[PDB]
Design a protein around this nucleic acid. Structure first.
Ligand code: MG
Ligand code: NA
Ligand code: ZN
Length: 352
DNA sequence: AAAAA
């Protein structure tokens, strides 16, 4: 039996159902841009369960015993089995509002509100937006437009590793005892990503040294001419608050990655790379690692399972047991899964 | 408002 919860499934990168899931992901995206939360959720959960299958669906009979496949989802599966394409997903891909929203939000610093503003202004291309003389851009949008081509190109593993080396060398300079872990998609086995994520923690740092680290590292990169964009969000972390972005100190950067630093098989001798850095208190390292490893659907199901099946409250900071009225401690992800009564799911099995 | 796993 297949669980309705992603945290109770193993979801590896060998997706045998890409024909179905790419269509369901398009339909979910469209419901997200069109403010239909209920419908977005249904397509996401159905796409997620199909991703977990060890075989391709080739008939409607193969969908038997699979949870989260409503009548609307089963009609989409049926249409794809019929001729290999989804008429519903194809109509979304041809929709003018969907196309503009995907295009505009592909720019770093442009979200739903700005994409909507530009669409209602009659803009349809990035060329027309960038060259417009009346529009005013935020500093994040200016960096988004300045480094567009590099940011829209996938970050690959040799590039993520070259960034990891930079992060580690910068962090060790100020905190020699620091632990630096690459998170997100790359930790789950992905060959590519839109960015590179890191979780930094220090067993000995004081509250102040841990506040100062991201400032020290970004200033060190600014001096070297590597910081292309920087936004540091201060911590709002509360040591004793119940579990519910996360509240940890973090920064969203654009780094200058020199081609010479990249050990791969293969113009300007550098590439712009989006880098996220998260600093957390040492005792909460496992919760932040679990939260930042993802995938987003895996994290959503973990929290839902903890609430509805275990009467536990879980987030990126802590795990609280409402019955025992006690916070549960963990030095690893394995201990969090054990506290939750879940079989351990390896990072590369969390691609829900 | 946007950045996010
Ligand atoms: Mg990522
Ligand atoms: Na964007
Ligand atoms: Zn990121």
């Amino acid at each position: 039996k297949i669980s309705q919860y992603a945290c109770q499934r193993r979801t590896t990168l060998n997706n045998y159902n890409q024909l179905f899931t790419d269509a369901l992901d398009i339909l979910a995206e469209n419901d997200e841009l069109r403010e239909n939360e209920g419908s977005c959720l249904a397509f996401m959960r159905a796409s997620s369960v199909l991703k977990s299958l060890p075989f391709p669906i080739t008939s409607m009979k193969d969908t038997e015993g699979i949870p989260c496949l409503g009548d609307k989802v089963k009609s989409i599966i049926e249409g794809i089995i019929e001729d290999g394409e989804s008429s519903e997903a194809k109509a979304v891909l041809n929709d003018e509002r969907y196309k503009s929203f995907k295009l505009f939000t592909s720019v770093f610093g442009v979200g739903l509100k700005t994409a909507e503003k530009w669409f209602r202004m009659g803009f349809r291309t990035l060329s027309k937006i960038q060259s417009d003389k009346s529009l005013r851009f935020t500093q994040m949008q200016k960096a988004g437009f300045l480094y567009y081509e590099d940011l829209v190109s996938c970050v690959n593993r040799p590039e993520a590793e070259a960034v990891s080396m930079l992060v580690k060398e910068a962090v060790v300079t100020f905190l020699p005892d620091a632990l630096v872990t690459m998170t997100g998609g790359f930790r789950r086995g992905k060959m590519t990503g839109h960015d590179v994520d890191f979780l930094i923690t220090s067993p000995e740092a004081t509250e102040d040294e841990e506040q100062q680290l991201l400032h020290k590292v970004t200033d060190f990169w600014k001096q070297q001419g590597l910081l292309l964009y920087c936004d540091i969000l201060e911590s709002t972390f509360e040591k004793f608050k119940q579990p519910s972005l996360d509240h940890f100190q973090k920064c969203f950067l654009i780094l200058k990655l020199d081609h010479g630093r990249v050990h791969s098989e293969k113009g300007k001798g550098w590439k712009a790379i989006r880098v996220d850095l998260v600093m957390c208190p040492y005792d909460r390292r496992a919760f932040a690692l679990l939260g930042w490893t993802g995938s987003r659907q895996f994290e959503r199901d973990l929290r839902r399972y903890a609430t509805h099946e275990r009467k536990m409250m879980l987030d990126n900071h802590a795990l609280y047991d409402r019955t025992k009225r006690v916070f549960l401690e963990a030095e690893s992800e394995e201990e969090i899964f054990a506290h939750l009564g879940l079989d351990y799911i390896e990072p590369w099995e969390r691609n829900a």
